[PDB]
Design an enzyme around this catalytic site. Sequence first.
Site, PDB file in Angstrom:
ATOM      1  N   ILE A 173      34.732  33.760  50.850  1.00 28.80           N
ATOM      2  CA  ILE A 173      35.445  34.248  52.020  1.00 28.80           C
ATOM      3  C   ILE A 173      35.141  33.290  53.162  1.00 28.80           C
ATOM      4  O   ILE A 173      36.043  32.665  53.731  1.00 28.80           O
ATOM      5  CB  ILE A 173      34.980  35.676  52.413  1.00 28.80           C
ATOM      6  CG1 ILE A 173      35.291  36.679  51.305  1.00 28.80           C
ATOM      7  CG2 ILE A 173      35.640  36.131  53.709  1.00 28.80           C
ATOM      8  CD1 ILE A 173      36.765  36.761  50.945  1.00 28.80           C
TER       9      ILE A 173
ATOM     10  N   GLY B 160      29.735  37.163  39.327  1.00 27.26           N
ATOM     11  CA  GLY B 160      28.675  36.312  38.807  1.00 27.26           C
ATOM     12  C   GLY B 160      28.290  35.162  39.733  1.00 27.26           C
ATOM     13  O   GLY B 160      27.582  34.238  39.327  1.00 27.26           O
TER      14      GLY B 160
ATOM     15  N   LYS C  29      44.439  33.329  56.551  1.00 28.86           N
ATOM     16  CA  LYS C  29      45.449  34.067  57.305  1.00 28.86           C
ATOM     17  C   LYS C  29      46.251  33.173  58.246  1.00 28.86           C
ATOM     18  O   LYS C  29      46.416  33.481  59.434  1.00 28.86           O
ATOM     19  CB  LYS C  29      44.813  35.214  58.092  1.00 28.86           C
ATOM     20  CG  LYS C  29      44.097  36.233  57.230  1.00 28.86           C
ATOM     21  CD  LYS C  29      45.021  36.773  56.150  1.00 28.86           C
ATOM     22  CE  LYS C  29      44.340  37.837  55.304  1.00 28.86           C
ATOM     23  NZ  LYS C  29      45.286  38.369  54.281  1.00 28.86           N
TER      24      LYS C  29
ATOM     25  N   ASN D  55      36.792  41.617  46.366  1.00 30.87           N
ATOM     26  CA  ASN D  55      36.622  41.849  44.929  1.00 30.87           C
ATOM     27  C   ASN D  55      35.208  42.300  44.572  1.00 30.87           C
ATOM     28  O   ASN D  55      34.996  43.431  44.122  1.00 30.87           O
ATOM     29  CB  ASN D  55      37.007  40.589  44.141  1.00 30.87           C
ATOM     30  CG  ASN D  55      38.451  40.157  44.404  1.00 30.87           C
ATOM     31  OD1 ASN D  55      39.344  40.995  44.539  1.00 30.87           O
ATOM     32  ND2 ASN D  55      38.677  38.851  44.490  1.00 30.87           N
TER      33      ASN D  55
ATOM     34  N   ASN E 223      41.891  30.813  43.046  1.00 29.15           N
ATOM     35  CA  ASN E 223      42.803  29.662  43.030  1.00 29.15           C
ATOM     36  C   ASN E 223      42.149  28.323  43.357  1.00 29.15           C
ATOM     37  O   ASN E 223      42.584  27.275  42.876  1.00 29.15           O
ATOM     38  CB  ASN E 223      43.939  29.864  44.040  1.00 29.15           C
ATOM     39  CG  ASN E 223      44.646  31.194  43.883  1.00 29.15           C
ATOM     40  OD1 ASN E 223      45.409  31.400  42.936  1.00 29.15           O
ATOM     41  ND2 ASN E 223      44.418  32.099  44.833  1.00 29.15           N
ATOM     42  N   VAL E 224      41.146  28.338  44.226  1.00 25.52           N
ATOM     43  CA  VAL E 224      40.574  27.076  44.672  1.00 25.52           C
ATOM     44  C   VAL E 224      39.797  26.462  43.524  1.00 25.52           C
ATOM     45  O   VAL E 224      40.056  25.321  43.127  1.00 25.52           O
ATOM     46  CB  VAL E 224      39.687  27.251  45.916  1.00 25.52           C
ATOM     47  CG1 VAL E 224      39.181  25.902  46.397  1.00 25.52           C
ATOM     48  CG2 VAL E 224      40.471  27.958  47.016  1.00 25.52           C
TER      49      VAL E 224
ATOM     50  N   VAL F 130      36.048  32.549  39.675  1.00 28.01           N
ATOM     51  CA  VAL F 130      37.378  33.134  39.775  1.00 28.01           C
ATOM     52  C   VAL F 130      38.067  32.665  41.064  1.00 28.01           C
ATOM     53  O   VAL F 130      37.399  32.296  42.037  1.00 28.01           O
ATOM     54  CB  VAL F 130      37.333  34.685  39.723  1.00 28.01           C
ATOM     55  CG1 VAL F 130      36.860  35.173  38.348  1.00 28.01           C
ATOM     56  CG2 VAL F 130      36.452  35.238  40.835  1.00 28.01           C
TER      57      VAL F 130
ATOM     58  N   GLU G  55      31.556  31.927  33.321  1.00 29.41           N
ATOM     59  CA  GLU G  55      31.727  33.340  33.179  1.00 29.41           C
ATOM     60  C   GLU G  55      33.128  33.572  32.639  1.00 29.41           C
ATOM     61  O   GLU G  55      33.350  34.420  31.772  1.00 29.41           O
ATOM     62  CB  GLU G  55      31.510  34.003  34.534  1.00 29.41           C
ATOM     63  CG  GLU G  55      31.585  35.481  34.500  1.00 29.41           C
ATOM     64  CD  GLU G  55      31.657  36.051  35.895  1.00 29.41           C
ATOM     65  OE1 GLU G  55      32.784  36.351  36.370  1.00 29.41           O
ATOM     66  OE2 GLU G  55      30.580  36.179  36.515  1.00 29.41           O
TER      67      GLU G  55
HETATM   68  C1  LIG Z   1      36.080  34.669  47.574  1.00 22.23           C
HETATM   69  C2  LIG Z   1      37.403  34.821  46.790  1.00 22.23           C
HETATM   70  C3  LIG Z   1      38.109  36.104  47.180  1.00 22.23           C
HETATM   71  C4  LIG Z   1      38.374  33.651  47.096  1.00 22.23           C
HETATM   72  O1  LIG Z   1      39.424  33.550  46.218  1.00 22.23           O
HETATM   73  P1  LIG Z   1      40.354  32.295  46.218  1.00 22.23           P
HETATM   74  O2  LIG Z   1      41.546  32.630  45.346  1.00 22.23           O
HETATM   75  O3  LIG Z   1      39.606  31.103  45.700  1.00 22.23           O
HETATM   76  O4  LIG Z   1      40.732  31.957  47.702  1.00 22.23           O
HETATM   77  P2  LIG Z   1      42.055  32.286  48.515  1.00 22.23           P
HETATM   78  O5  LIG Z   1      42.039  31.321  49.690  1.00 22.23           O
HETATM   79  O6  LIG Z   1      43.323  32.137  47.694  1.00 22.23           O
HETATM   80  O7  LIG Z   1      41.968  33.734  49.154  1.00 22.23           O
HETATM   81  C5  LIG Z   1      41.962  34.944  48.406  1.00 22.23           C
HETATM   82  C6  LIG Z   1      42.023  36.163  49.231  1.00 22.23           C
HETATM   83  O8  LIG Z   1      40.882  36.234  50.058  1.00 22.23           O
HETATM   84  C7  LIG Z   1      41.290  36.210  51.387  1.00 22.23           C
HETATM   85  N1  LIG Z   1      40.386  35.439  52.184  1.00 22.23           N
HETATM   86  C8  LIG Z   1      39.820  34.266  51.865  1.00 22.23           C
HETATM   87  N2  LIG Z   1      39.043  33.867  52.891  1.00 22.23           N
HETATM   88  C9  LIG Z   1      39.120  34.796  53.866  1.00 22.23           C
HETATM   89  C10 LIG Z   1      38.549  34.924  55.133  1.00 22.23           C
HETATM   90  N3  LIG Z   1      37.678  33.891  55.633  1.00 22.23           N
HETATM   91  N4  LIG Z   1      38.825  36.011  55.875  1.00 22.23           N
HETATM   92  C11 LIG Z   1      39.650  36.954  55.414  1.00 22.23           C
HETATM   93  N5  LIG Z   1      40.220  36.863  54.203  1.00 22.23           N
HETATM   94  C12 LIG Z   1      39.969  35.805  53.412  1.00 22.23           C
HETATM   95  C13 LIG Z   1      42.658  35.596  51.353  1.00 22.23           C
HETATM   96  O9  LIG Z   1      43.426  36.033  52.421  1.00 22.23           O
HETATM   97  C14 LIG Z   1      43.177  36.092  50.132  1.00 22.23           C
HETATM   98  O10 LIG Z   1      43.574  37.433  50.321  1.00 22.23           O
HETATM   99  P3  LIG Z   1      45.121  37.898  50.335  1.00 22.23           P
HETATM  100  O11 LIG Z   1      45.772  37.490  49.040  1.00 22.23           O
HETATM  101  O12 LIG Z   1      45.160  39.411  50.495  1.00 22.23           O
HETATM  102  O13 LIG Z   1      45.823  37.228  51.509  1.00 22.23           O
HETATM  103  C15 LIG Z   1      37.113  34.841  45.281  1.00 22.23           C
HETATM  104  O14 LIG Z   1      36.575  33.624  44.851  1.00 22.23           O
HETATM  105  C16 LIG Z   1      36.129  35.906  44.839  1.00 22.23           C
HETATM  106  O15 LIG Z   1      36.444  37.096  44.863  1.00 22.23           O
HETATM  107  N6  LIG Z   1      34.742  35.532  44.638  1.00 22.23           N
HETATM  108  C17 LIG Z   1      33.817  36.558  44.199  1.00 22.23           C
HETATM  109  C18 LIG Z   1      33.496  36.526  42.711  1.00 22.23           C
HETATM  110  C19 LIG Z   1      33.042  35.161  42.210  1.00 22.23           C
HETATM  111  O16 LIG Z   1      32.840  34.222  42.958  1.00 22.23           O
HETATM  112  N7  LIG Z   1      32.707  35.028  40.818  1.00 22.23           N
HETATM  113  C20 LIG Z   1      31.996  33.820  40.354  1.00 22.23           C
HETATM  114  C21 LIG Z   1      31.909  33.687  38.843  1.00 22.23           C
HETATM  115  S1  LIG Z   1      33.454  34.020  37.993  1.00 22.23           S
END
Ligand SMILES: CC(C)(COP(=O)(O)OP(=O)(O)OC[C@H]1O[C@@H](n2cnc3c(N)ncnc32)[C@H](O)[C@@H]1OP(=O)(O)O)[C@@H](O)C(=O)NCCC(=O)NCCS
Lengths: 513, 504
Positions: free
Chosen positions: B363, B387, B407, B383, B271-272, B269, B293
């Site tokens: 993160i 998975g 940020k 979140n 954007n990246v 899940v 997933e």
């Molecule tokens: C880790 C995760 C949050 C990153 O999502 P992403 O869309 O690829 O990355 P983004 O850079 O767009 O960041 C998403 C959010 O996390 C925050 N974030 C990302 N890295 C961060 C960090 N190092 N410190 C603080 N916040 C962070 C961003 O600020 C953003 O939050 P916001 O919209 O409130 O500003 C997301 O992949 C996730 O929840 N993973 C857990 C579940 C998963 O991996 N499932 C796998 C099988 S489906």
Amino acid sequence: TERIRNVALRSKVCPAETASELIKHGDVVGTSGFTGAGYPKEVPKALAQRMEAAHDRGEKYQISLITGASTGPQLDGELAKANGVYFRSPFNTDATMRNRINAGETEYFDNHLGQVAGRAVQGNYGKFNIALVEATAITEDGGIVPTSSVGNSQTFLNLAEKVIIEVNEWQNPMLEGIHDIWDGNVSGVPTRDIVPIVRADQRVGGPVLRVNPDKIAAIVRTNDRDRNAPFAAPDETAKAIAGYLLDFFGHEVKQNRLPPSLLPLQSGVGNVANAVLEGLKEGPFENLVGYSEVIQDGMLAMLDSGRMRIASASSFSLSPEAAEEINNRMDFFRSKIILRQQDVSNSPGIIRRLGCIAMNGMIEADIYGNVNSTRVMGSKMMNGIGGSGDFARSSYLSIFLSPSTAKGGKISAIVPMAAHVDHIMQDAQIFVTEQGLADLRGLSPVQRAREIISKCAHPDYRPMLQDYFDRALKNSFGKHTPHLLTEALSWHQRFIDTGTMLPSSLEHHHHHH
Amino acid sequence: TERIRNVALRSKVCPAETASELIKHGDVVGTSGFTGAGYPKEVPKALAQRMEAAHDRGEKYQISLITGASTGPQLDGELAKANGVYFRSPFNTDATMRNRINAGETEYFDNHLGQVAGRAVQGNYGKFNIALVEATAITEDGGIVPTSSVGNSQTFLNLAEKVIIEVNEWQNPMLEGIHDIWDGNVSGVPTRDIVPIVRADQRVGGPVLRVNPDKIAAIVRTNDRDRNAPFAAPDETAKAIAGYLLDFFGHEVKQNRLPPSLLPLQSGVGNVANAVLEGLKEGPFENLVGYSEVIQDGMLAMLDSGRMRIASASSFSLSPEAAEEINNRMDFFRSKIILRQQDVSNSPGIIRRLGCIAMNGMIEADIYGNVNSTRVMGSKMMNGIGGSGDFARSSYLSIFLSPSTAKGGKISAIVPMAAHVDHIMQDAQIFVTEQGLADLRGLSPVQRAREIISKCAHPDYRPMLQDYFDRALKNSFGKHTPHLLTEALSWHQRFIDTGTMLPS
Ligand SMILES: CC(C)(COP(=O)(O)OP(=O)(O)OC[C@H]1O[C@@H](n2cnc3c(N)ncnc32)[C@H](O)[C@@H]1OP(=O)(O)O)[C@@H](O)C(=O)NCCC(=O)NCCS
Ligand SMILES: CC(C)(COP(=O)(O)OP(=O)(O)OC[C@H]1O[C@@H](n2cnc3c(N)ncnc32)[C@H](O)[C@@H]1OP(=O)(O)O)[C@@H](O)C(=O)NCCC(=O)NCCS
Ligand SMILES: [Cl-]
Ligand SMILES: [Cl-]
Ligand SMILES: [Cl-]
Ligand SMILES: [Cl-]
């Protein structure tokens, strides 16, 4: 009688020193050896001598050593003494090797044991130049009968450019037949085969490791014993831990959450494991089954009594007295034990299907139940993750067991934050110390902390933990997993600085008031 | 066309309000719903209103809410606003619920998604009082046709004392036939069955969830939409990450370490991960297959371009616009997609067998390549692990993807020590940021650090990370995984104190 039953291969027999000459500076060497059992002994000793001699002349001579798991003084010990190992994987318990690793003189990575073979085939360790494997016998058709462990030996034989076999007459001939080696694709190129194990007692392969005889460059006749560490007789702390665990099992059975035969059991080795195994021998549970990495003293006891019906593992981990017992009676024990490749004994698919109960030790857990199995103060390696991750995550129940303190009370095994994490909260459901048992099923992190602090922490440290927790609840950036990053690792730093985690009354500590 | 095709069951239709009355304070409720798809909608709203009224009268009224994964405003949102969820598992993305969780007002545990069914059957969440499941249709023989996800629905149906079905006319009738529900023992009492999946595109079950009609206490006719959050159109940062990974895959193929059509792809899940899929849709790898997933916009795009032949998942995670596209072309896509139970899509035994390539966001990672997927500053839930663990540990290759900073540059995504660990070093082989790619295979922790710092860290933070590492190597208690415990978490604290990890 004759251990090499293939006549042609007899032509390859040579002295340890000569065989050792096949191993060159920079080589990647894969060896047999797992929990101090079945590792090569004579060739490594000869190799270490030649290494030291080279070094004394300003000549470089080191190898990459990949094993099943831990070995013994003849291998890890000698090579570490010689400063002959530039990279080591995946698991070590030798004191000299540990020192090389912690001084940065030997590079180390402790892969999950069940994954080692797959990563080796993938090429992560590079090209294998040598496979050095201990054998009980060589069969008429050139099959290699392993000794007191299987480990990764089949994979190493497949990968290695050249093969050296040590045929060890110390090892009982009736070990032939105890092993189960699959020719199936467990750890090779995807798509892999289904590993069709649906019972802990199920054999899927045959008794021999297979290797193209043309790769066998040397065979060495040997006669030397494994590392049979002394029996760790349970102390009162271990007996207490085992008591809480057995009470819990009994309750799960009375609530129909476990059958009276429990489920297939995986346990580590040591004081606490021994205590649990003695508890099980005496307990109300019948028809027990082992699906583990190791066969230990207490298991033979239950196999003998009939309390345990079968024990699956990759290796033996026995005291000298227990090894003596199994040798005088290999005929009987061979029918009660199956030794498997470690990528099968530690296969997550199989562990989950069988519904194993995992029981493992730990360095420490934090108040939220994240577990450190490896790195003291976060930086100093003990042994390695081993198969604890394989089993913890895949098990039907994941249980971690430890004395509530370490170093004669100067360290708390329950800390504000673990200095290193091996097992995340999601991978640990039950904690047991001599203070009690925390059942964490279905709990959030804050709820986990309430149970761990109240049930498991030592009375000398509970107020300090509760204080940390209470103040984190009030001040943490978020309240889902409350921490104070200003002091989260401060108990470890206190130990580094003062040799104890207990605070002085000569300065303010919040819990003192 | 009538959605309730079993005539006898039509006698069970009632209002959402009346249905909600079946749910008592203290109840454990298992619902459909996964990545904003297929969760119940009307019963939760009526429940929430009634909870607020009760609280005002001084009557306790909360439930335990167990799902497939994330839901939406009508479920997590409404129930959170009403202060009506005392425990939540396993995965949430709703802002109101997230705030409840981070305030300590709702208890939360993010289990591995593939394990949730088994833990429910084991009884870890208690006895299931209710299963509330959204359906496209009920067949003549009483089969329940799932909507946009399968998730844990079959398990919750099995376990629950009473079943409430929301039949949602908004959902596409052509969803029928897309799902593959296995009747074997995946998550039940050991010994479990072998799941005979040996190819990502293999169906082993049927199109419907099974439930005893006697357990259906109410059926509610509903009309409301799934919660589609859009994906960031790949920017410079995401495109650079995708570029490094595609180049990496290319070299692997060239070295014969991957086949030309790669291996079954899991894309996490966020954007990246999504942006990588966009790179793939016009990439040099043909006849790809997904075993994932979720199917995000980018993967639907790969099926459209023909670069991907088939995709397995438990759920759709589509933007509002992609979700509109698939409904207008459900015939084209229905033969390219298999929706499975989450305990099958996320089964470690199957994932390893197939040799999946796992691509997930994060993160942060520390210099040793431990990964935080979940808890900002170590304490604030984003979140959930979801998975990512099921896949990272089981995969043939585990890859993590992230901008090198967060940020607006005020946070480094590469830190001295992760404030929370979800994936240990052993579970992460490859890291990609817009700065470069770190290949960690076969390396010790000190060697991992060299690669991560030099390849992945932002230039603003690299010297600080190197400084930390060099001084740790000199002064750490042990040298295997050198740390300076006085400052390991000091960047995170700096952010808490000042709003930035960059010093004055
Ligand atoms: C880790 C995760 C949050 C990153 O999502 P992403 O869309 O690829 O990355 P983004 O850079 O767009 O960041 C998403 C959010 O996390 C925050 N974030 C990302 N890295 C961060 C960090 N190092 N410190 C603080 N916040 C962070 C961003 O600020 C953003 O939050 P916001 O919209 O409130 O500003 C997301 O992949 C996730 O929840 N993973 C857990 C579940 C998963 O991996 N499932 C796998 C099988 S489906
Ligand atoms: C964690 C582990 C080291 C505990 O070992 P144990 O025999 O059960 O328990 P012990 O109390 O005897 O501790 C072992 C060593 O770790 C040290 N130790 C344990 N907890 C410690 C702590 N919180 N802080 C510092 N040192 C600690 C002990 O001092 C002891 O060191 P020593 O040999 O110098 O005296 C051990 O379980 C292990 O290495 N686990 C990893 C592999 C594994 O679990 N595989 C599973 C299948 S066998
Ligand atoms: Cl399998
Ligand atoms: Cl749980
Ligand atoms: Cl399976
Ligand atoms: Cl590796």
